[PDB]
Enzyme design. Structure first.
Site, mmCIF file in Angstrom:
data_model
loop_
_atom_site.group_PDB
_atom_site.id
_atom_site.type_symbol
_atom_site.label_atom_id
_atom_site.label_comp_id
_atom_site.label_asym_id
_atom_site.label_seq_id
_atom_site.Cartn_x
_atom_site.Cartn_y
_atom_site.Cartn_z
ATOM 1 N N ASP A 16 -7.415 1.137 3.920
ATOM 2 C CA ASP A 16 -7.015 0.124 2.937
ATOM 3 C C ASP A 16 -8.194 -0.549 2.247
ATOM 4 O O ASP A 16 -8.082 -1.552 1.538
ATOM 5 C CB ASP A 16 -6.128 -0.918 3.615
ATOM 6 C CG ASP A 16 -6.789 -1.710 4.728
ATOM 7 O OD1 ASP A 16 -8.036 -1.720 4.856
ATOM 8 O OD2 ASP A 16 -6.025 -2.344 5.496
ATOM 9 N N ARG A 30 -9.912 -4.277 -1.519
ATOM 10 C CA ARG A 30 -9.018 -4.349 -0.372
ATOM 11 C C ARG A 30 -7.596 -4.203 -0.903
ATOM 12 O O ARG A 30 -7.274 -4.914 -1.860
ATOM 13 C CB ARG A 30 -9.188 -5.664 0.378
ATOM 14 C CG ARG A 30 -8.136 -5.932 1.450
ATOM 15 C CD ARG A 30 -8.431 -5.087 2.669
ATOM 16 N NE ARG A 30 -7.681 -5.396 3.869
ATOM 17 C CZ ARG A 30 -6.398 -5.178 4.108
ATOM 18 N NH1 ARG A 30 -5.612 -4.624 3.191
ATOM 19 N NH2 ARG A 30 -5.896 -5.528 5.286
ATOM 20 N N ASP A 35 -1.603 -3.597 5.788
ATOM 21 C CA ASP A 35 -2.590 -3.420 6.842
ATOM 22 C C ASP A 35 -2.541 -2.013 7.424
ATOM 23 O O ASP A 35 -1.526 -1.660 8.035
ATOM 24 C CB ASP A 35 -2.352 -4.410 7.991
ATOM 25 C CG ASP A 35 -2.892 -5.791 7.677
ATOM 26 O OD1 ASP A 35 -3.684 -5.924 6.716
ATOM 27 O OD2 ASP A 35 -2.519 -6.744 8.396
ATOM 28 N N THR A 36 -3.583 -1.213 7.272
ATOM 29 C CA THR A 36 -3.562 0.094 7.934
ATOM 30 C C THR A 36 -4.307 -0.033 9.253
ATOM 31 O O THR A 36 -5.024 -1.017 9.431
ATOM 32 C CB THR A 36 -4.215 1.194 7.098
ATOM 33 O OG1 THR A 36 -5.479 0.702 6.623
ATOM 34 C CG2 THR A 36 -3.371 1.519 5.881
#
Length: 136
Positions: A16, A30, A35-36
């Site tokens: 990400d 970002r 959220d990875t």
């Protein structure tokens, strides 16, 4: 109304976070609202599906004809100096694609940077109904 602006890939850093050429300058970006799993955890190290999310973002960006950045309505940079945006690869939103594949969770949302939140939550609910990757 949000607007897309063109950008050029410099380097994908992980699921990400990416480095792009934007208005003549290299900038770290970002991905908004997702959220990875991390590959660079000082803590954990490579978390589960971290390398997977990473390869997906990388391929998707590297194989695109066109990349575009879409800033939300709020702050455009975080405290670390990273641009905060929705990234498009040939008209497809990278942030949704990750969530749709169960390779990312929708983040904690911070208004007013939350325009595509519901869209993303809808994709996350489907990846969870289909039990993909993270949700499996």
């Amino acid at each position: 109304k949000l607007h897309k602006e063109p950008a050029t890939l410099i380097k994908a850093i992980d699921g990400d976070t990416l480095k792009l050429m934007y208005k003549g300058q290299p900038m770290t970006f970002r991905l908004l609202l997702v959220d990875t799993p991390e590959t660079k955890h000082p803590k954990k190290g490579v978390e589960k599906y971290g390398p997977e999310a990473s390869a997906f973002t990388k391929k998707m960006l590297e194989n695109a004809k066109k990349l575009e950045v879409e800033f939300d309505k709020g702050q455009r940079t975080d405290k670390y100096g990273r641009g905060l945006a929705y990234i498009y690869a040939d008209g497809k939103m990278v942030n949704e694609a990750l969530v749709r594949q169960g390779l990312a969770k929708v983040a904690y949302v911070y208004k007013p940077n939350n325009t595509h939140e519901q869209h993303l939550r809808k994709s996350e609910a489907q990846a969870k109904k289909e039990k993909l990757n993270i949700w499996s």
